[PDB]
Amino acid sequence: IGTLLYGANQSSKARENKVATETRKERMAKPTIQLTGADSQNPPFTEKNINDWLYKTVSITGRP
Amino acid sequence: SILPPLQYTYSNEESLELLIHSIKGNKDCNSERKAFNLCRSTVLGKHVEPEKCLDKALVFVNCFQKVRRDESAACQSAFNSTLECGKKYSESTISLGSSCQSQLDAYLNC
Amino acid sequence: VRLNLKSNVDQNEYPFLAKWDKDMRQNYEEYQNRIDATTYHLQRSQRGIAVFGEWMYPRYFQKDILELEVLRRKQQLGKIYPEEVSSYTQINPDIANDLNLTFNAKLLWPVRGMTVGAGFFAFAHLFNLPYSFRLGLFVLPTAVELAFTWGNKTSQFKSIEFMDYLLQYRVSKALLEKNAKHFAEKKAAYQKEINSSQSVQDLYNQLITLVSEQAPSE
Amino acid sequence: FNSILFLLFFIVNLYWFNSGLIFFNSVYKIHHDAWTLIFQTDSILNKLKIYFFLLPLYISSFIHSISTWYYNYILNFLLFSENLNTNTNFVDYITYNTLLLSKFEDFNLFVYI
Amino acid sequence: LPIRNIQFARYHYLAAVTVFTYFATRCCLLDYKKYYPLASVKK
Amino acid sequence: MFKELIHIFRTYYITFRYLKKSNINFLKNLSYTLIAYYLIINFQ
Amino acid sequence: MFSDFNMYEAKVFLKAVADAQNTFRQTAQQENQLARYESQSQSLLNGSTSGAISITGDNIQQGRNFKALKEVKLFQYSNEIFKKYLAGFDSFSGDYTAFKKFLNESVKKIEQDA
Amino acid sequence: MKLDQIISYYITPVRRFDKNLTAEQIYEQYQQAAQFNEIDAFTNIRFHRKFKEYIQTQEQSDYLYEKAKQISTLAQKMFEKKFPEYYT
Amino acid sequence: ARLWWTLDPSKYYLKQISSGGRNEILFTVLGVTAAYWYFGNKRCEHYWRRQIDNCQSWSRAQNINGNNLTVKQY
Amino acid sequence: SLVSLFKNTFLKSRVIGLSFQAQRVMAQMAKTDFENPDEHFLLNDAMKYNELVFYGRLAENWSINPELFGKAELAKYNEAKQTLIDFNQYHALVQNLHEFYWELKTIYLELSRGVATSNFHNKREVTHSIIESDIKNSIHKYIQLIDDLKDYPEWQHKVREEIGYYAHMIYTSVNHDGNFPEIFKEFNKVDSLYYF
Amino acid sequence: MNHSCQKVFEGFVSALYDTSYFFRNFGPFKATIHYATYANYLAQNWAPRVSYIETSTPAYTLAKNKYAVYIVYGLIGGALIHNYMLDNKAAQKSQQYYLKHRD
Numbered sequence A: 001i002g003t004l005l006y007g008a009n010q011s012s013k014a015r016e017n018k019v020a021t022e023t024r025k026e027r028m029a030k031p032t033i034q035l036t037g038a039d040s041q042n043p044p045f046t047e048k049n050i051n052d053w054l055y056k057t058v059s060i061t062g063r064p
Numbered sequence B: 001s002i003l004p005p006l007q008y009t010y011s012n013e014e015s016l017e018l019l020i021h022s023i024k025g026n027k028d029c030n031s032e033r034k035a036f037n038l039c040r041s042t043v044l045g046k047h048v049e050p051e052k053c054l055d056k057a058l059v060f061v062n063c064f065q066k067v068r069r070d071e072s073a074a075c076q077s078a079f080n081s082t083l084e085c086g087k088k089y090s091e092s093t094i095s096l097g098s099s100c101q102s103q104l105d106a107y108l109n110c
Numbered sequence C: 001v002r003l004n005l006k007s008n009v010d011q012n013e014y015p016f017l018a019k020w021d022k023d024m025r026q027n028y029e030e031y032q033n034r035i036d037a038t039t040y041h042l043q044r045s046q047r048g049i050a051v052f053g054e055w056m057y058p059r060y061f062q063k064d065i066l067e068l069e070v071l072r073r074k075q076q077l078g079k080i081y082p083e084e085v086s087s088y089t090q091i092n093p094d095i096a097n098d099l100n101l102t103f104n105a106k107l108l109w110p111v112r113g114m115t116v117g118a119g120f121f122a123f124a125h126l127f128n129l130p131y132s133f134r135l136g137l138f139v140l141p142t143a144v145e146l147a148f149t150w151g152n153k154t155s156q157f158k159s160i161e162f163m164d165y166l167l168q169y170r171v172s173k174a175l176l177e178k179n180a181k182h183f184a185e186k187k188a189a190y191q192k193e194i195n196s197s198q199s200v201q202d203l204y205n206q207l208i209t210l211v212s213e214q215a216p217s218e
Numbered sequence D: 001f002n003s004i005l006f007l008l009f010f011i012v013n014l015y016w017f018n019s020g021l022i023f024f025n026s027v028y029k030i031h032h033d034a035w036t037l038i039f040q041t042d043s044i045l046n047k048l049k050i051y052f053f054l055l056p057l058y059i060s061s062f063i064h065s066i067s068t069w070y071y072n073y074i075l076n077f078l079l080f081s082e083n084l085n086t087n088t089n090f091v092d093y094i095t096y097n098t099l100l101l102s103k104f105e106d107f108n109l110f111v112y113i
Numbered sequence E: 001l002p003i004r005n006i007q008f009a010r011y012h013y014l015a016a017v018t019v020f021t022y023f024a025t026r027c028c029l030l031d032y033k034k035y036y037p038l039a040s041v042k043k
Numbered sequence F: 001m002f003k004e005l006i007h008i009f010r011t012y013y014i015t016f017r018y019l020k021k022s023n024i025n026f027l028k029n030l031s032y033t034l035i036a037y038y039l040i041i042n043f044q
Numbered sequence G: 001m002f003s004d005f006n007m008y009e010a011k012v013f014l015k016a017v018a019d020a021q022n023t024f025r026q027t028a029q030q031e032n033q034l035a036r037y038e039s040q041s042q043s044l045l046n047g048s049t050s051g052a053i054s055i056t057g058d059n060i061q062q063g064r065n066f067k068a069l070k071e072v073k074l075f076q077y078s079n080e081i082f083k084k085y086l087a088g089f090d091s092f093s094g095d096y097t098a099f100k101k102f103l104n105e106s107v108k109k110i111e112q113d114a
Numbered sequence H: 001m002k003l004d005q006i007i008s009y010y011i012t013p014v015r016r017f018d019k020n021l022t023a024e025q026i027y028e029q030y031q032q033a034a035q036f037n038e039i040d041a042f043t044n045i046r047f048h049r050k051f052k053e054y055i056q057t058q059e060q061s062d063y064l065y066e067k068a069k070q071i072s073t074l075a076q077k078m079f080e081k082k083f084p085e086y087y088t
Numbered sequence I: 001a002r003l004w005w006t007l008d009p010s011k012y013y014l015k016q017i018s019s020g021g022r023n024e025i026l027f028t029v030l031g032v033t034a035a036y037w038y039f040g041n042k043r044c045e046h047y048w049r050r051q052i053d054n055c056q057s058w059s060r061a062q063n064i065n066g067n068n069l070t071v072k073q074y
Numbered sequence J: 001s002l003v004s005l006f007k008n009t010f011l012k013s014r015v016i017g018l019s020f021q022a023q024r025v026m027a028q029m030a031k032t033d034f035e036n037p038d039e040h041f042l043l044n045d046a047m048k049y050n051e052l053v054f055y056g057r058l059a060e061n062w063s064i065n066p067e068l069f070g071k072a073e074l075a076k077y078n079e080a081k082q083t084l085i086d087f088n089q090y091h092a093l094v095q096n097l098h099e100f101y102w103e104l105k106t107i108y109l110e111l112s113r114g115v116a117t118s119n120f121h122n123k124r125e126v127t128h129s130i131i132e133s134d135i136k137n138s139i140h141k142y143i144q145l146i147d148d149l150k151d152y153p154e155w156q157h158k159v160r161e162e163i164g165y166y167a168h169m170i171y172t173s174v175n176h177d178g179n180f181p182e183i184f185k186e187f188n189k190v191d192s193l194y195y196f
Numbered sequence K: 001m002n003h004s005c006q007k008v009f010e011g012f013v014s015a016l017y018d019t020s021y022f023f024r025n026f027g028p029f030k031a032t033i034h035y036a037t038y039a040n041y042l043a044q045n046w047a048p049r050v051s052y053i054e055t056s057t058p059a060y061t062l063a064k065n066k067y068a069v070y071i072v073y074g075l076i077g078g079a080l081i082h083n084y085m086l087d088n089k090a091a092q093k094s095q096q097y098y099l100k101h102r103d
């Protein structure tokens, strides 16, 4: 019973992971956003609204 | 919960001031309020074309603002006395007693 | 307010608006009397004392508040036609079944209960049961149907939702009729240029999204 | 040879088939064209797992394939017309149609009943 | 023979009956929509 | 109260005589449960 | 505190004031909504005529003249102003008062540069 | 519940305005709040999402939206100055 | 007639348990815990509320079929 | 085995405690009539009657762990189990007799409603064949029970006094014509004389 | 009644009786009914109570059986009063929080 429940959980996780992959692929398919100057110095990314920018292509300038 | 939520948070002092000013206005400028209600009761004047009631609403709001802005020194004194008594009544968590009807009547008769 | 029953709207130019205003004015007196009665009852119950009143005024007089809200919205709407009910059938298939139980539109007979009673009557006739027994078995399903039919304040809630929807729809329709002549000229070129029947707001939102996604920031 | 046992087995098979149909419908909605990648995986363990857990679906598909083959043969015999769409051999046709499970993509037993 | 808290039991039964009747009949919470026509008006 | 009501119904109505004391007790238990539920819910 | 008559008078007066504020809101919203509908319709017509976008069925597609679209110009200028004047707005994890001060300073800068 | 507590539910839906402001000034403020500009389509997108992080009361909502509208109006004026062609 | 009204408890339900009095304190504790939980949830839901009315509070309507809700001017 | 220990302790305690009361419970059941043999337990005082009814099944079914039992303790538990089984059989017999009594009372009630003064809608002058046959078969079964209860004079006397009362009432409720002699042939032998 | 209807009625009543008997005497159903009956008896005749017949001498009666009513009253009253005080405190906290947040 334990391993059957684990297998069912694994199948559910597989479905959830593929749905996440599909949505992330759709998000990445969008054109890249170029952040320069003031935007580059102050990136829009924030923990408050990170989901809006998650898995989105951004061209940013900075000093590594 | 079934009670409606609050939109604007009024301090106790602000709530008492607005309540007293509203009571005073309901006597001072009742005609404008009645005209505004009459113009806003109709479907055309309420939903379809509310702009026709704009002038009457402006007049009523001007009258209410005049009431709120106590110009006379006697009016200011009476309002201050009534507001202080109301503050004491509200802050009195112990068993409540006498009312502020006398002070309200003086402010309305000012 | 004692509004007059003669609508001041021009029927030749704003037919639906004039009809709505006429119906609203016609029913306003009755609905205002009902609203005044309800408000008086509420305020007196509040003025009551201890358990007879204030101690449990807001929380236990809920049916009165619901009736007051229903009366206010129905007064604002004036009258309801089957076309709007069919329109709202999209979101509420049982809209008619709820509006009939909410408002005193038509007399409702317990048809299902009477049919069950007739079936029990046939059973009793077949098995030679007393006429008193079969009459009781006819009354019982009718009573059950009536009990399950009347009341049902969920129907009143859904009627309130439908009335809000209908009021918004009527306001939008009135604006459409008011601005039809102004938008006539622009409408022809829009029909001759755009072959889609979708809403301008939806198309503009989609265009804004497309610009935000594809247009270069530069 | 008990009617009660037969009915219980039939009910259990119905429930199992319905669950398999729901699972397959979800997996197909998620893998419109990639479902075969997991259903017919070359791994023996995965193949056995799929066959065991979708046995009602596979037996139903086998019965449907046999019935369709016989019906097509009857039509050809009666009408002197064409072949079974193509000239596929019996073994190839039956194996292909039994392995193919897309026929259940939009089918739910409870909804149909 | 002695009954523990017999007076408490009597009062609890009386209170239960009173509350049940109160909620069932709504005797204290009457309706005055019928009295509205027979009442004066202010303002 | 409930006992008195049941007694009056049994002594006056001939048809009510069919019910057993067991059935009367079952009705009593259901009525007590419903009354308790009513008292609890009215305050919720 | 006060007599019930005075309380009901105050309730009626407050209802009237709320209705007046609603009247103001309705008037302004209706006017600006008519203006918005006219502007959006005209923008869509101009785009379709110039070929910036192709509107078929229930979808809008990028045309060959997309770069000249007035909506594109508006978006570019909005980005330009958000960069030059209202910098740091996208990521400003400050207090409410600090946010208000930042908005006020941005408004003052825009007014000065306008 | 006493009238002293009930009246709070009728005092709450009234927006607070300075007692020295005229009805015309209040209506002008409402008009400015409801003003419409073409550039609003994108500035609103970039403003409201941020404002969702700070709005917890109607007063905060009003202040933030009014400031956004003022900024949008200034931006619209500047854009009209920059691109006279689209507005002739 | 015979007088029968009385507030006294019936001896049928007055029996005690073998270990002492009936299980009163335990059930009172359980009821107090349940009431605490219920009233805490109700208070938390009731008091921490506000009504925000702005454009972001409105979303596009749709039918039960998922399509956008639009009604013609028939 | 802590769980086994707890199970055995519970079973022993309940079984022995209720075996010590089965005698009183059965005596009260015998004392009460067949219309509601549990009337005393339902109305006046439930002297572990429901407890006996519940735990009889447990004694019959639930297993035992002798290693957790002593010698005299095991013997006492077996005696209590046998007593509970006897109580179950007695309850089954009482239920059967009570149901037969209620069958006869149903016949009597059907007759009574026919002659009720309030019966202004279903007044029938002549008794019908269905109820006549029901009465005949019920009387035949009652006579068979009386014959089968020959070895228990007290049980036979109670069965007569309780069940045959309604048979005598049915006898009195109809005139002595038509099929009456054939219907009450068996009753008239002894039972009619007793109810005079 | 008509003899044909009598046959039908006899068959119907026999079917009803057989169905009821089977459902009541079926193994799992019988066990469920038995356990549910004992549970209902326990719930109805052994519910928590404050008044009971005292058949023990004051020397053989526990102090719990003498102060249970007082303990229960104290618990209930304290719970109600504490809930009222918590409601007041939550009201004050929410008022202060939103006031300091704005206006």
Ligand SMILES: CCCCCCCCCCCCCCCCCC(=O)OC[C@H](COP(=O)([O-])OCC(O)COP(=O)([O-])OC[C@@H](COC(=O)CCCCCCCCCCCCCCCCC)OC(=O)CCCCCCCCCCCCCCCCC)OC(=O)CCCCCCCCCCCCCCCCC
Pocket (backbone or CB within 6 Å): E008, E009, E010, E012, E013, E016, F029, F030, F032, F033, F036, F037, F040, I009, I010, I013, I023, I024, I025, I027, I028, I029, I030, I031, I032, I034, K036, K039, K040, K043, K044, K045, K047, K048, K049, K050, K051, K072, K073, K074, K076, K077
């Ligand atoms: C499948 C199974 C079978 C199904 C069958 C079908 C039917 C359903 C059956 C199910 C079983 C449950 C049925 C309910 C029980 C019925 C009992 C009964 O009939 O007894 C009759 C029998 C009647 O006998 P009687 O001779 O008439 O005597 C009654 C008189 O009233 C004599 O009464 P009394 O005197 O003994 O009084 C009772 C005593 C009882 O009290 C208690 O001990 C109880 C306390 C409450 C505890 C609550 C515990 C709840 C726990 C819940 C946990 C969560 C559950 C979640 C479930 C999830 C599912 C798994 O009360 C008190 O002690 C009074 C307290 C008063 C407090 C006063 C406060 C004053 C404050 C001020 C302080 C001082 C300030 C001074 C200031 C000075 C300023 C100057 O009653 C009793 O003898 C017992 C007392 C009555 C108890 C009532 C209990 C009702 C419970 C209802 C529960 C409903 C739940 C539904 C859940 C739904 C979920 C979906």
Ligand SMILES: CCCCCCCCCCCCCCCCCC(=O)OC[C@H](COP(=O)([O-])OCC(O)COP(=O)([O-])OC[C@@H](COC(=O)CCCCCCCCCCCCCCCCC)OC(=O)CCCCCCCCCCCCCCCCC)OC(=O)CCCCCCCCCCCCCCCCC
Pocket (backbone or CB within 6 Å): C130, C132, C133, C134, C135, C136, C139, C140, C143, C146, F012, F013, F014, F015, F016, J112, J113, J114, J116, J117, J118, J119, J122
């Ligand atoms: C609007 C909201 C909805 C309202 C409706 C709600 C209904 C809910 C479901 C009701 C289910 C009831 C049936 C189950 C209960 C047990 C019945 C039973 O034992 O079955 C066998 C028993 C039949 O036994 P049987 O062997 O055939 O009869 C011979 C035995 O000796 C008989 O021995 P017994 O002593 O056992 O039999 C007595 C039997 C009573 O049976 C009888 O013996 C005779 C029944 C008819 C009596 C008719 C009146 C006779 C003359 C009296 C004087 C009146 C003068 C009026 C003029 C005055 C002018 C100043 O008593 C009962 O039925 C007990 C329960 C009665 C109350 C519940 C039913 C109320 C129904 C009310 C509506 C009736 C339909 C509309 C009528 C109006 C149309 C314009 O009952 C039935 O099968 C018949 C059931 C009753 C049928 C309706 C008869 C009319 C009753 C009117 C009562 C008025 C009360 C005032 C308040 C009304 C407010 C709405």
Ligand SMILES: CCCCCCCCCCCCCCCCCC(=O)OC[C@H](COP(=O)([O-])OCC(O)COP(=O)([O-])OC[C@@H](COC(=O)CCCCCCCCCCCCCCCCC)OC(=O)CCCCCCCCCCCCCCCCC)OC(=O)CCCCCCCCCCCCCCCCC
Pocket (backbone or CB within 6 Å): F040, I016, I017, I018, I019, I023, I026, I027, I030, I031, J014, J051, K035, K036, K038, K039, K042, K043, K044, K046, K047, K048
């Ligand atoms: C709380 C949330 C969760 C609830 C879960 C409920 C689950 C119920 C499932 C029932 C399954 C069938 C049971 C068959 C019987 C098997 C047990 C047995 O034979 O009894 C052995 C044992 C002793 O029996 P006995 O040896 O035959 O004793 C009686 C003889 O007279 C000999 O007597 P004695 O003089 O020798 O003395 C022995 C004394 C021995 O007593 C004890 O030893 C028990 C004392 C109490 C508990 C003590 C321990 C406390 C701590 C427990 C910790 C557990 C932690 C669990 C951890 C789990 C983690 C996974 O016996 C008693 O006094 C019996 C007490 C009966 C209490 C009845 C309560 C009825 C009222 C309930 C509702 C209250 C609501 C009030 C609301 C008012 C608001 C204003 O009895 C019990 O276990 C008592 C069980 C009573 C409750 C069962 C019914 C509950 C139903 C609640 C209402 C639900 C309605 C919902 C809607 C309906 C559809 C869902």
Ligand SMILES: CCCCCCCCCCCCCCCCCC(=O)OC[C@H](COP(=O)([O-])OCC(O)COP(=O)([O-])OC[C@@H](COC(=O)CCCCCCCCCCCCCCCCC)OC(=O)CCCCCCCCCCCCCCCCC)OC(=O)CCCCCCCCCCCCCCCCC
Pocket (backbone or CB within 6 Å): J003, J006, J007, J010, J057, J061, J062, J063, K027, K028, K029, K031, K032, K035, K036, K039
């Ligand atoms: C949605 C909400 C739902 C919840 C709320 C509900 C509210 C409404 C009331 C509901 C009432 C109706 C309930 C449905 C009827 C149930 C009928 C049933 O069980 O059928 C079996 C019954 C078969 O058994 P049987 O024929 O009577 O027995 C012979 C068999 O050969 C078996 O032979 P065996 O010897 O191998 O097996 C005997 C025993 C398995 O034997 C064992 O392995 C040992 C079991 C424990 C024995 C007792 C030891 C107690 C130790 C002290 C504990 C103290 C705790 C702390 C408190 C201390 C202070 C007081 O197996 C059973 O038959 C178990 C019956 C149920 C439990 C009986 C024990 C009651 C007392 C213990 C629990 C209550 C606490 C009392 C605390 C106070 C005590 C003084 O019939 C069926 O097979 C029917 C099956 C189909 C129906 C559904 C089945 C559901 C199964 C549920 C099992 C639950 C287990 C307990 C869970 C506890 C979790 C915390």
Ligand SMILES: CCCCCCCCCCCCCCCCCC(=O)OC[C@H](COP(=O)([O-])OCC(O)COP(=O)([O-])OC[C@@H](COC(=O)CCCCCCCCCCCCCCCCC)OC(=O)CCCCCCCCCCCCCCCCC)OC(=O)CCCCCCCCCCCCCCCCC
Pocket (backbone or CB within 6 Å): F020, F022, F023, F026, J091, J092, J095, K019, K020, K021, K023, K024, K029, K032, K033, K036, K037, K040
């Ligand atoms: C149509 C469906 C109705 C379903 C009813 C509910 C399910 C059955 C009851 C389960 C236990 C409930 C809790 C205990 C309550 C107290 C029980 C009691 O004292 O009743 C006896 C007492 C004595 O009367 P009697 O006429 O001499 O006995 C019945 C006749 O023998 C025979 O006459 P009869 O008319 O009763 O014949 C049966 C006829 C039925 O006739 C009808 O059409 C009945 C019409 C009245 C319906 C009443 C509805 C009451 C709803 C509440 C029930 C309580 C539980 C639910 C609580 C939450 C509710 C929200 O058709 C059936 O067989 C019905 C289906 C039976 C399947 C039962 C499946 C196992 C039990 C499942 C539920 C257990 C609770 C689980 C909780 C959750 C666990 C996780 O009977 C009554 O109370 C009369 C009313 C009938 C009550 C239901 C049936 C009881 C059967 C008990 C038989 C015991 C053996 C007989 C002696 C043998 C000695 C050797």
Ligand SMILES: CCCCCCCCCCCCCCCCCC(=O)OC[C@H](COP(=O)([O-])OCC[N+](C)(C)C)OC(=O)CCCCCCCCCCCCCCCCC
Pocket (backbone or CB within 6 Å): F012, F013, F014, J112, J113, J115, J116, J117, J118
């Ligand atoms: C919405 C519907 C409303 C309908 C309203 C109907 C009202 C019905 C009121 C009924 C009152 C009670 C009598 C019927 C029920 C009796 C039940 C019962 O238990 O009784 C059983 C007993 C009868 O049975 P029994 O006496 O044989 O007792 C049973 C005995 N064993 C068990 C042995 C069989 O009592 C009666 O039925 C008594 C009936 C008396 C009838 C009196 C009639 C008076 C008529 C007056 C007319 C006045 C006209 C004036 C005109 C003036 C013009 C100017």
Ligand SMILES: CCCCCCCCCCCCCCCCCC(=O)OC[C@H](COP(=O)(O)OCCN)OC(=O)CCCCCCCCCCCCCCCCC
Pocket (backbone or CB within 6 Å): E012, E013, E015, E016, E017, E020, F001, F002, F003, F005, F009, F013, F027, F031, F032, F033, F035, F036, I006, I007, I008, I009, I010, K076
């Ligand atoms: C032909 C037509 C035929 C028609 C037939 C119709 C038959 C219908 C039969 C059923 C309906 C009967 C209705 C009777 C009237 C209502 C009576 C009532 O409410 O009480 C019921 C019962 C107590 O009354 P009763 O049992 O009847 O009399 C006992 C006398 N010692 O109460 C109970 O037992 C209920 C359980 C609770 C009892 C009270 C408990 C104490 C009260 C305080 C509880 C505190 C809880 C915790 C604290 C809360 C507050 C802080």
